[PDB]
Ligand binder design. Structure first.
Ligand SMILES: *[C@@H]1O[C@H](CO)[C@@H](O[C@@H]2O[C@H](CO)[C@@H](O[C@@H]3O[C@H](CO[C@H]4O[C@H](CO)[C@@H](O)[C@H](O)[C@@H]4O)[C@@H](O)[C@H](O[C@H]4O[C@H](CO)[C@@H](O)[C@H](O)[C@@H]4O)[C@@H]3O)[C@H](O)[C@H]2NC(C)=O)[C@H](O)[C@H]1NC(C)=O
Ligand SMILES: *[C@@H]1O[C@H](CO)[C@@H](O[C@@H]2O[C@H](CO)[C@@H](O)[C@H](O)[C@H]2NC(C)=O)[C@H](O)[C@H]1NC(C)=O
Ligand SMILES: *[C@@H]1O[C@H](CO)[C@@H](O[C@@H]2O[C@H](CO)[C@@H](O)[C@H](O)[C@H]2NC(C)=O)[C@H](O)[C@H]1NC(C)=O
Ligand SMILES: *[C@@H]1O[C@H](CO)[C@@H](O[C@@H]2O[C@H](CO)[C@@H](O)[C@H](O)[C@H]2NC(C)=O)[C@H](O)[C@H]1NC(C)=O
Ligand SMILES: *[C@@H]1O[C@H](CO)[C@@H](O[C@@H]2O[C@H](CO)[C@@H](O)[C@H](O)[C@H]2NC(C)=O)[C@H](O)[C@H]1NC(C)=O
Ligand SMILES: *[C@@H]1O[C@H](CO)[C@@H](O[C@@H]2O[C@H](CO)[C@@H](O)[C@H](O)[C@H]2NC(C)=O)[C@H](O)[C@H]1NC(C)=O
Ligand SMILES: *[C@@H]1O[C@H](CO)[C@@H](O[C@@H]2O[C@H](CO)[C@@H](O)[C@H](O)[C@H]2NC(C)=O)[C@H](O)[C@H]1NC(C)=O
Ligand SMILES: *[C@@H]1O[C@H](CO)[C@@H](O[C@@H]2O[C@H](CO)[C@@H](O)[C@H](O)[C@H]2NC(C)=O)[C@H](O)[C@H]1NC(C)=O
Ligand SMILES: *[C@@H]1O[C@H](CO)[C@@H](O[C@@H]2O[C@H](CO)[C@@H](O)[C@H](O)[C@H]2NC(C)=O)[C@H](O)[C@H]1NC(C)=O
Ligand SMILES: *[C@@H]1O[C@H](CO)[C@@H](O)[C@H](O)[C@H]1NC(C)=O
Ligand SMILES: *[C@@H]1O[C@H](CO)[C@@H](O)[C@H](O)[C@H]1NC(C)=O
Ligand SMILES: *[C@@H]1O[C@H](CO)[C@@H](O)[C@H](O)[C@H]1NC(C)=O
Ligand SMILES: *[C@@H]1O[C@H](CO)[C@@H](O)[C@H](O)[C@H]1NC(C)=O
Ligand SMILES: *[C@@H]1O[C@H](CO)[C@@H](O)[C@H](O)[C@H]1NC(C)=O
Ligand SMILES: *[C@@H]1O[C@H](CO)[C@@H](O)[C@H](O)[C@H]1NC(C)=O
Lengths: 124, 435, 124, 435, 124, 435
């Protein structure tokens, strides 16, 4: 592979081929306190991202598809425009405003899905 | 008809501040506080990535500054206290072997010192360098008696710098700038990712930076704002200038007990001629070095502008005089012989006289003074000048003078290549996939 | 909506729609040690509950239906009483005596299910 | 036909004890050690939640006690030690401008104390307040010489209370009681959830509570057991009573070096007449306040009975008189004019005489003494009386006296509205859903 | 009916039924530092194992069947010779030289699996 | 046609080095720093598991050593420093009631000590045991006023060994060897898993091991290398030997103030006659014990040899005699009466004379000296010899001597059954299923 973050600068549809690579590096006398704080902090960040995925309905997946439609008001591009002629750093800047909107929609959709599953399982 | 897809492990980041730890590579910069470095550290080149760097707002410098002070202070915590020395001293001049370079630079002082037993006293004599002794009204006291506590540095702990690597915690990375001839503030077209910085020796000096990295091809002049006279200019050389420093006197060191478990070290006497400490540089190397600096400096001033060099205008010895730790002794060298020229469009050295001071007040703090115990024998050290710190005077012929007094400048000089970013692996994008 | 525990006191049924609100708010000079201890506990708790959900086969869900039948000896109540005329604080008190029994049964059921799945895959 | 369903994120909790951290918003509370607060805190009302509170079994009080003491001690770590003052003092009376209220209160003492150099002494003259000096056999010693080490408080550090907000760690929440007329031990019908408490000022006092919260509608009398005469009664007032305190003397403060890097502060002289320190409480306001207190006490002790107020029965000054920190000085103000009345079913003020003491022994500890340096000029402070601490004597007439001295009661008064609970998000219930 | 590690020494087959027993016991003045280091380390190890299961697509299971075929170069025993006549301590030593080969293959297999699924959903 | 299957919760482990914590069960060590033990600890027997143990490479021992020293040092941090005692003492030996066993073993010394006020001095008379007092040129000083500084142990803090349990962190476990006649280095056929060790009393001694565990059936001789004379031999007895120790002198203890909150304790006088300290060991029990040791030694050296016991060859008192803490007193007993016999293939006791020493340099360190306050009254203690420490010399006769110290070998006698392992729950195996 290109190594950790070696894909940066690559277009989105190519960079996404090596997501595993950046996942494994998230978990890898003050002197002792500075080190404990650094270790604790890495764990807290890891867990917060994992919780967001769990709430949204994604558990161990690096790639997951949801039931929330894309709004052209967030971004109006040719799709190929994004995947073939743009990198992830650029994309992240482009839609940073809509981050919380999208996340809120992701939580709402999953909550509705869990309730619907429960009712269907009860039927027999 | 596109759908939101969530991706994790996305190679993106944001500027961030965090806590870094040391990985090292009996000493003040305790390695007991660090972890070992990788025998095989990695570096990843990032193709088609341009990052913005700003060395003047780089928080790695502030953190390095604080770690160094803390290590320094810890190293003195268990050492002998010298409070019992703050007594009236009875002093005469050391005139026994004077060349008139050292006239008045040494005092012979006698005093009533404490002993192991509370009910006993001993008469002791020792030598002082004038810089560390102040007259009371032949009645003298040490300079620290009216401002600070004095602590003797432990004779077993070295002041030799050990290159220290800084390492980011998991979830963070350090981006390094590989753009040659980079001034520290613009976009950097060629970058790479590392987890740990190169090892940096925490060399302490003013005016002339010693034992740092060199510019790859050309002298690089870096400043926060080149037209702001309140800012210092950091000049990175592309070639070293060799400097040979010495304290050419054979010192005989004496030691006495001052209390249970404690002893004081001092110079007893000097064998042979008493000579002034000094540093040598080549005239030719130095004159070529300035010519290169001036040529680059002109880019911001014009070819119709005369560039002149001058000595510092004044202030405390620790700022106006070049300083460094050589052999464990603290040297204060006069650089007026280096910065005295005007630039208009073979076995011959420059000798810089130097003084020695035993009472040290670093980081310009008041209340914490260190006593540097004497070094037995004769001291010689050789080092490389790798950069200059200059300031500029406030309708023609710009004048530059040596600067310093703020240690964060030395660190910025090495830490201009690195920035810390937080990795943000989670994000979204539209796809044709739904569920 | 109601930012945190707002549903406390509402019926068990009504409160089921705010599970997201409480879940997302979990895990979110020696006075440095007190701060580290607090941060660590925030992680040890939470992470411990995630393990139970893992073991029981509920690792990715806020609502998880299992194969363990309800025993009237734990609580002999009408579902309409439980879901419409009680809140969660009240419910938890009524069955706090049977919590360990239920948890043990949930672990046994999931373990049996994983073994059964492995055998079916082997046969298929 | 029902199945177990597991739910995560269930809005339930249990009583729990955890460690809280401070958030704040130079000083003796070392507020720089706290995590700055959120400018927009939230309070979530819990409709239909009734909780049991018990202010007397509340461990938030115990933590506040432990941290206030710890912060207090840490603030003295870098301050000047006054060991050199434990010498024989030669003392005479200050008689030049005395009103005869302060007869013998001030003493003019002289003594032999050290200087920057260990071989030299200086004669020092200073004023003491009698409470802080004890006779040896005109030979005196400081009161701390046979029990404790004395440390000078740092003159740059303020003792003024700064509001502290206590915040629960993630996974925990604090429930607040919003009910009016809540006595701290019963069920509370209206509660809300907060993450951080109301800021609480660490105001230190005895006998009467200063600068706290007010009761919403009426005086509230709180006690662990009202019929147990051995318990303190905490009375929260509905409206404040204004109190104006002063040390009406223009003091000239001088300082001398006592050793390298250290200096001692003392009162040099007094300009103009020497007058007794005192506090002013309006008579009408105070008499109305007691009438409200008595009415509420009768609800527990009987209409056809008599309530009498009296002075503390005796004991150490730190307990029996009112005490507070005013401008940095420590006052000991008599309450005899406040609690002298029998209650049976005008632009004038009550003047309370006060004493000043420079050697302070806080938190009822022995071995750790602090010297409060004197303050130059004249001191005046105005504060609000927001509650009282009463005890009851062990017929038809009950007698109440000022009490306290146990600092946990001052805090307990402010923290009565809060309890800490652990969130327990995981639980089960039967449903018709199976898989 | 066994406590922690009570199955050690039993055959691999027998020991596979106590996985829950070991799993549930994971996580379960210089002195402040020693306690924080002990707590932090236990958490870090737990999380690294979970991350790895996550990457492989085994995050919710104690027994996880994957798509990587077994290579006889790692071990050429019969399944009886492994499951009935060996314990796990012995097995782990026998194949300790292939651990990183197997793990790398597992990461690759799951990444291929995720891509295939994303494309099928997009297809129809 | 097999597939990889991943299993989690697999019962396997690897040898590992981690940090263990203490769990408890007015003490010198901070027992309050430990967590209370499990009221119902479990032990799991692992059937059909054989593990390799090595008591000589066990890192649990190293941590126990480090923890004990640190705990010890913590206990002296708040105690009175005795620096002011380092004065010339005027001494004339006590000779009021002696038996010629104690002639010259006690000294009546006087000195000018400090007082609460800096202006005063007091004359103090005290008794010393000679070992602590060294002649300067009748002029004597304390032995530890040049190499060290002395801190008085706090008189309220007990040195009685309190058993401390060691516990592993989650993710780690301790394997306990339960095999009779186990020598500490081979495979152990029967092991069990515990989370915590039994409590181990931190008994400090030389020559003989006191109050430890006994061997199940026979004396067990353990050594790193039995033929290497550079190694010590640890012999575990299967039966205790009772030893009765005493200081049969009724001391009157006096104290003085030496500063503002500091006091010094010393022996004032002796009531009755002056007698030597001593220990009693029964001859029959001791001779039976050696016979068992000899039989077990023959198994390693030959059944046709001679085993000879001898006393120590020389060195410091701390390594040539049997050191132990009895009632808080420090004893140095002569073992020559125990190890003086050649073995060739009715209340009759052995009396070991003992000396008493008050200034103790623990853990073979320099610069940290402790003063043990005197104990009023008479001291008697009874303890069990549970093992021996022997060394072997360089013919047909093997000579053994008591060998002691290093404060790691004593611990190894209890921490030999335990090993720490890391749990490794994840692994793979081939099977029939795929997906
Ligand atoms: C090997 O193992 C043995 C057995 O455990 C240890 O021997 C014990 O050691 C302890 C500590 O020295 C002894 O405890 C002390 O006993 C003193 C006498 O009290 C007893 O006898 C009187 C007789 O009048 C009775 O009234 C009383 O109830 C007891 O039965 C006490 O005076 C001591 O307390 C004093 O010191 C402590 C601080 O240490 C203070 O806190 C107290 O206030 C007080 O001033 C103390 O309790 C115990 O008696 C010994 N047992 C036996 C059988 O002799 C060995 O020490 C151990 N070997 C080694 C090397 O550790
Ligand atoms: C950096 O950008 C260059 C383009 O300037 C990328 O190179 C192209 O890659 C595609 C796909 O393999 C080829 O079809 C083109 O012919 C290449 N162009 C050139 C000029 O070489 C390069 O891959 C990018 N680097 C990274 C890491 O993504
Ligand atoms: C370092 O290089 C940067 C360019 O990369 C210089 O910044 C530019 O300065 C001009 C004025 O001369 C402005 O018009 C541009 O907008 C600036 N660009 C950026 C990106 O900041 C900077 O002055 C140089 N500094 C030194 C000391 O040489
Ligand atoms: C860089 O330094 C120049 C000084 O040479 C700054 O220019 C001055 O800015 C102040 C404030 O707006 C004006 O009052 C002066 O008249 C300006 N001086 C000149 C010569 O133009 C400039 O603002 C600084 N730039 C930055 C980014 O700090
Ligand atoms: C607290 O209890 C009251 C009383 O049961 C709840 O009020 C009911 O709310 C529903 C929904 O708005 C209405 O349809 C009912 O008519 C109300 N009942 C009455 C008697 O007015 C209230 O919602 C509960 N609070 C919470 C947070 O659940
Ligand atoms: C200095 O002040 C003390 C009080 O602190 C005076 O002592 C009192 O003197 C009167 C008159 O003789 C006695 O009635 C009191 O009983 C004494 N008080 C105490 C506590 O003993 C002392 O006389 C004053 N000295 C001078 C010179 O004014
Ligand atoms: C504070 O109010 C509570 C009621 O909310 C009082 O508690 C009752 O006290 C009586 C004794 O007089 C008991 O018999 C009741 O069982 C208690 N009820 C409850 C709900 O606890 C309490 O005594 C009051 N305390 C004060 C000082 O006023
Ligand atoms: C403890 O017992 C073990 C046997 O379990 C001894 O180990 C043997 O030592 C000999 C030395 O010559 C080796 O050749 C053998 O290979 C070792 N066997 C095993 C199984 O390790 C050990 O030396 C004994 N130690 C002591 C001090 O008695
Ligand atoms: C145990 O100690 C003996 C020494 O008592 C070691 O044996 C020596 O080994 C060296 C190196 O091979 C030889 O040159 C010597 O001649 C041997 N001496 C004797 C008396 O045999 C032995 O190697 C040590 N055992 C271990 C495992 O380290
Ligand atoms: C030491 O003290 C004596 C006191 O009589 C004094 O005469 C002498 O000058 C002092 N010596 C020194 C070197 O200060
Ligand atoms: C239901 O609970 C009772 C009481 O604990 C128990 O005896 C009974 O066996 C349980 N039912 C089943 C099916 O196990
Ligand atoms: C200072 O010391 C001298 C010693 O001669 C003594 O006479 C004098 O009274 C002392 N002064 C004071 C204020 O105690
Ligand atoms: C040990 O081996 C015996 C057969 O000899 C077997 O019955 C027993 O179950 C085994 N022990 C364990 C823990 O599996
Ligand atoms: C105490 O000091 C006096 C000073 O004159 C001296 O004569 C005496 O010998 C000292 N006492 C002792 C025990 O050293
Ligand atoms: C100790 O000595 C005194 C003085 O000679 C004597 O009277 C007393 O009896 C002696 N005590 C003993 C136990 O010998």
């Amino acid at each position: 592979s290109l190594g950790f973050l070696g894909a940066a600068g690559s277009t989105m549809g190519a960079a996404s081929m090596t997501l595993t690579v950046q996942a494994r590096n998230l978990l890898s006398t003050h002197w002792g306190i500075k080190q404990l704080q650094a270790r604790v902090l890495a764990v807290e960040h890891y867990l917060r991202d994992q919780q967001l995925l769990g709430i949204w309905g994604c558990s161990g997946k690096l790639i997951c598809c949801t039931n929330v439609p894309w709004n052209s008001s967030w971004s109006n591009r040719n799709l190929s425009e994004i995947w073939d002629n743009m990198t992830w750093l650029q994309w992240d800047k482009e839609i940073s405003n809509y981050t919380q909107i999208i996340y809120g929609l992701l939580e709402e959709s999953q909550n509705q899905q869990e309730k619907n599953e429960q009712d269907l399982l009860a039927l027999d | 008809n596109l759908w939101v897809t969530v991706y994790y492990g996305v190679p993106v980041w944001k500027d961030a501040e965090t806590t870094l730890f040391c990985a090292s590579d009996h000493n003040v910069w305790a390695t007991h506080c660090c972890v070992p470095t990788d025998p095989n550290p990695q570096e990843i080149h990032l193709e088609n990535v341009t990052e913005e760097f700003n060395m003047w707002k780089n928080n790695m410098v502030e953190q390095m500054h604080e770690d160094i002070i803390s290590l320094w202070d810890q190293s003195l915590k268990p050492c002998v206290k010298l409070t019992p020395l703050c007594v009236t001293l009875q002093c005469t001049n050391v005139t026994n072997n004077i060349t008139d370079d050292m006239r008045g630079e040494l005092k012979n002082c006698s005093f009533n010192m404490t002993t192991e037993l509370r009910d006993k006293k001993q008469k002791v004599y020792s030598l002082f360098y004038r810089l560390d002794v102040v007259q009371i009204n032949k009645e003298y006291r040490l300079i620290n008696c009216n401002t600070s506590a004095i602590t003797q540095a432990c004779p077993k702990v070295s002041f030799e710098p050990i290159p220290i690597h800084y390492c980011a915690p998991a979830g963070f990375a350090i981006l390094k700038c590989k753009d040659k001839k980079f001034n520290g503030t613009g976009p950097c077209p060629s970058v790479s990712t590392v987890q740990c910085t190169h090892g940096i020796k925490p060399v302490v000096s003013t005016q002339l930076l010693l034992n740092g990295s060199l510019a790859e091809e050309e002298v690089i002049i870096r400043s926060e704002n080149i037209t702001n006279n309140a800012k210092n200019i950091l000049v990175q050389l592309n070639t070293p200038v060799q400097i040979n420093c010495t304290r050419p006197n054979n010192n005989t060191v004496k030691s006495i007990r001052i209390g249970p478990g404690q002893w004081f070290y001092y110079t007893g006497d000097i064998i042979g001629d008493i000579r002034q400490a000094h540093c040598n540089v080549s005239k030719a190397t130095w004159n070529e070095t300035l010519g290169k600096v001036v040529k680059q400096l002109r880019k911001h001033f014009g070819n119709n502008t005369i560039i002149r060099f001058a000595q510092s205008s004044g202030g405390d010895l620790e700022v106006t005089t070049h300083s460094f730790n050589c052999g464990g002794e603290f040297f204060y060298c006069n650089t007026s012989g280096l910065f005295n020229s005007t630039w208009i469009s073979s076995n011959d050295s420059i000798t810089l006289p130097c003084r020695i001071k035993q009472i040290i007040n670093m980081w310009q703090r008041i209340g914490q003074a260190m006593y540097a115990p004497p070094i037995q024998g004769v001291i010689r050290c050789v080092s490389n000048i790798t950069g200059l710190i200059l300031t500029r005077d406030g309708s023609t012929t710009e004048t530059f003078r040596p600067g310093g007094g703020d240690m964060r400048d030395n660190w910025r000089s090495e830490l201009y290549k690195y920035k810390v970013v937080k990795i943000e692996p989670l994000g979204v994008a539209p796809t044709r996939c739904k569920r």
